[PDB]
C-alpha cells in the first residue's frame, strides 16, 4: 500500500554474475542494517564462473558493493590412503544467502566432490557446500554435510540407499531464532531430497581449514525412504521455519517438495526430529506446488500462518482451455492442536506465463494497521511481461483478495524482477518495514522504502 515506487534505490553487480539471485538483510553487532547479495555466476580467480557474495552498505543512492570474500580454490587432501577433492568451478556460490545475528551464510549448491582410492572413486557429484562468515571479525567456516568417502561400488551393492552424493546442500536455507542452520538438499537420497541441520556455533567451533571431511556431532539429517511417492520429489527445494504445534519450546520446519508423488507437489510441516505433523498436497500436477513457502501470521491471532506458491498453476478459462498463470495458497493455523484445513484463500495470477507465486515474502506490518502483510512475485507478469510484485494486506479473516499495490519492474525484459524477495526489516530507520527485490537477469537489486500512509 505505502511502498514508495517513485524514488527507488539500485545496487548493481558485475555483468553476467546474476547479482540479485538471492538476498537478505543483515544487521551487524551494532544493529546497522545492510544487504547481503548473492551472485552465483561471478568470475573466480581462474576467469571461471564460481559465484560470489556482496555486502552492500545502506545508501539511498545505491551503487556498487564490496565483496564478502571466500576461498574459491579447489582443495586436495591425501589421507587414509585416499584422495579427497573439491571442485568449485560453476558451484554457484551465492545461489542462496541468509543472515542470522552477525553471521552470513552463503551456499554453493553445485559444488562438486569426489574421492579417489587407487582405481576406484566415489564419483564426481554435486554435494554442495555452504560458506559461513562473521564479517566484522573476519572469521570463516564451512559446512558440507553430504560429503562422503564411500566408494562407488558400495552404493551399487547396497541399491543406492542413503546416497548423499547429489545433495546440492544449500539449494534452500533458513536459520532458526535460536541459531540452528537448516539446509535444503533436494537431490538427497538419490533425488528424494533431505534436510540437514546444525547449530551455527557448532559449525564454527568444529571447522578447521584443510580437513575437508569432519564431523559436526550436533548435526541431524533427515531420513531416506522406500516410498515411491517421494522419488524425484526434490524434498527441500524450499524451506522455512515457524511455530505450528503450540509448544513454544520447539521449532517446526516447513519443507517444499514440488515434484512429490509424480509431480503432484506437496508441502510438509515437521518437528525438529523430522517426524511429520502435516502434509499439504498440490492441487494440479506439474504446477510446482511447493516452489516457495513463507511463514507469517496474517490475521493477528498470534498463530503463524502458511502460504504456498505454485507458479505454474494452469487456471481454467473459457472453452475448456487452461492458462498458466500461477497461484498462491494461504493456510490459517487453527486454535490449539488441530490440522491445517483447506486453503482459506486462493490468489491466482493474471498474465500468461507470469509465474505468479514464484516468491512469497513476509513484509511484517507495512501499513501499521496491526496485521502482517505479504508480497507475491510474478517475475514475468505485467502487461509487458517485464515482471510485477503484488502486495496483499492482512486482515481479521486472513488476507485481502485484491492487491493494495502493484510494483512494476524498472528493468528491461528478461530481468526476472521478483525472482528473489525479502521484507519485514526497516533499513532506513523510519519506523516502516521495507522491501528489497532482486532482478538477477539485470544483475541488480531494487530497494523499496515504505512511507507513512497517504
Amino acid at each position, epitope marked *: 500500500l505505502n511502498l514508495d515506487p517513485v524514488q527507488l534505490t539500485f545496487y548493481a553487480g558485475p555483468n553476467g554474475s546474476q547479482f540479485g539471485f538471492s538476498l537478505d538483510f543483515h544487521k551487524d553487532s551494532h544493529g546497522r542494517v545492510a544487504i547481503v547479495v548473492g551472485a552465483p555466476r561471478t568470475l573466480g580467480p581462474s576467469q571461471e564462473e564460481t559465484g560470489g557474495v556482496f555486502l552492500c552498505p545502506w545508501r539511498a543512492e545505491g551503487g556498487q558493493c564490496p565483496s564478502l570474500l571466500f576461498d574459491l580454490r579447489d582443495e586436495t587432501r591425501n*589421507v*587414509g*590412503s585416499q584422495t579427497l577433492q573439491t571442485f568449485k568451478a560453476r558451484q554457484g556460490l551465492g545461489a542462496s544467502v541468509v543472515s542470522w545475528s552477525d553471521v552470513i551464510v552463503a551456499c554453493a549448491p553445485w559444488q562438486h566432490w569426489n574421492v579417489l582410492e587407487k582405481t576406484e572413486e566415489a564419483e564426481k557429484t554435486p554435494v554442495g557446500s555452504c560458506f559461513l562468515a562473521q564479517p566484522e571479525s573476519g572469521r570463516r567456516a564451512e559446512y558440507s554435510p553430504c560429503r562422503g568417502n564411500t566408494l562407488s561400488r*558400495i552404493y551399487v551393492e*547396497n541399491d543406492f540407499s542413503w546416497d548423499k552424493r547429489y545433495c546440492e546442500a544449500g539449494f534452500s536455507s533458513v536459520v532458526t531464532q535460536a541459531g540452528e542452520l537448516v539446509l535444503g538438499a533436494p537431490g538427497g537420497y538419490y533425488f528424494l531430497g533431505l534436510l540437514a541441520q546444525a547449530p551455527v556455533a557448532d559449525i564454527f567451533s568444529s571447522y*578447521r581449514p*584443510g580437513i575437508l571431511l*569432519w*564431523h559436526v*556431532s550436533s548435526q541431524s539429517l533427515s531420513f531416506d525412504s522406500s516410498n515411491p511417492e517421494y522419488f524425484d520429489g526434490y524434498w527441500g527445494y524450499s524451506v522455512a521455519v515457524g511455530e505450528f504445534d503450540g509448544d513454544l519450546n520447539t521449532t517446526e520446519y516447513v519443507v517444499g517438495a514440488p515434484t512429490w508423488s509424480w509431480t503432484l507437489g506437496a508441502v510438509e510441516i515437521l518437528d525438529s526430529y523430522y517426524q511429520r505433523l502435516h502434509r499439504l498436497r498440490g492441487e494440479q500436477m506439474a504446477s510446482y506446488f511447493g516452489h516457495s513457502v513463507a511463514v507469517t501470521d496474517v490475521n493477528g491471532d498470534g498463530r503463524h500462518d502458511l502460504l504456498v506458491g505454485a507458479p505454474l498453476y494452469m487456471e481454467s478459462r473459457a472453452d475448456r482451455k487452461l492458462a498458466e498463470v500461477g497461484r498462491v495458497y494461504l493456510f490459517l493455523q487453527p486454535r490449539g492442536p488441530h490440522a491445517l484445513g483447506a486453503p482459506s484463500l486462493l490468489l491466482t495470477g493474471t498474465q500468461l506465463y507470469g509465474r505468479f507465486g514464484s516468491a512469497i515474502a513476509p513484509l511484517g506490518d507495512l501499513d501499521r494497521d496491526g496485521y502482517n502483510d505479504i508480497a507475491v512475485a510474478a517475475p514475468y507478469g505485467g502487461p509487458s511481461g517485464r515482471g510485477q510484485v503484488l502486495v496483499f494486506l492482512g486482515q481479521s479473516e486472513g488476507l485481502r483478495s485484491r492487491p493494495s499495490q502493484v510494483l512494476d519492474s524498472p528493468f528491461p525484459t528478461g530481468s526476472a524482477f521478483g525472482f528473489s524477495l525479502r521484507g519485514a526489516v526497516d533499513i532506513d530507520d523510519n519506523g516502516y518495514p521495507d522491501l528489497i527485490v532482486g532482478a538477477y537477469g539485470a544483475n541488480q537489486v531494487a530497494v523499496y522504502r515504505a512511507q507513512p500512509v497517504v
Partner: antibody
Amino acid sequence: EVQLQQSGAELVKPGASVKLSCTASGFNIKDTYVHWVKQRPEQGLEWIGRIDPANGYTKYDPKFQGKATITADTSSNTAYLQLSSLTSEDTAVYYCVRPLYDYYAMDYWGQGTSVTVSS
Amino acid sequence: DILMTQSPSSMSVSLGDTVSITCHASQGISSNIGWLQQKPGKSFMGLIYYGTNLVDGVPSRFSGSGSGADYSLTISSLDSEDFADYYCVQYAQLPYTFGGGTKLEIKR
C-alpha cells in the same frame, strides 16, 4: 560427554578366544570410525583395524589378519574386538579409539582392556 | 608401511622449561599426524590432530608444527602433570603407524 567404557580385564588360555567390548556413552557409536589399538611395553603401539558401525565395513592391518575380528552392534551402542587362537604374544592392553572432528584422526580413547594369556 | 621415528627416546627436564619432541616419517605425510599423551598408569589423551590443531580441552602451552615428513610437539613452560609419555601417529596411509614414544622425566 564423549566417553568410551571398555569391558573388564580378561584372563584366558592359549588357543581359546576372547571378545572385548567398547560402549559409547553420550553419543551414537554410528557417528564415526571406531579403531582398535594394541599396546605392549617393548613393541609399543600397534594399530589393529577400524570399523564403520554405520555399515559394518572394516579395515585391518595385515599383521592381524586372522586373529582380529571387529564388529559393532548399533542397538547396544557397542563395538567389539574378537581375538582367536591366543598366544603369549597376544598379551597386551587393548584400546578403542575414535576421532573428534577429522574423519581420520585418533582423539578419544577408552580406558583400555587388559588381556593375559597363560596356561 | 610408514615408519615413525620419534626422538628422543626420553628427556630429563624441569618445570618451566620449553621442550620439543620430534617425529620423522619415512615419507611425506602432509600434516596427517596426531600427538598423544599417556599419563603414568593411565589411558591416552589426544593433544594435536592434523599437525597443528588442539583437541578440545587442551591447554595452549601445547602446540604442534612441521611439514612434509618432519614434525614437532612443543610444551612451553612445563607443568607438573606434563611429565608423562608422548606418541606421534600418522594417518596419511593405512595401516596407521605410531612412533616409538618419548618419556618426560624430572631433572635433578
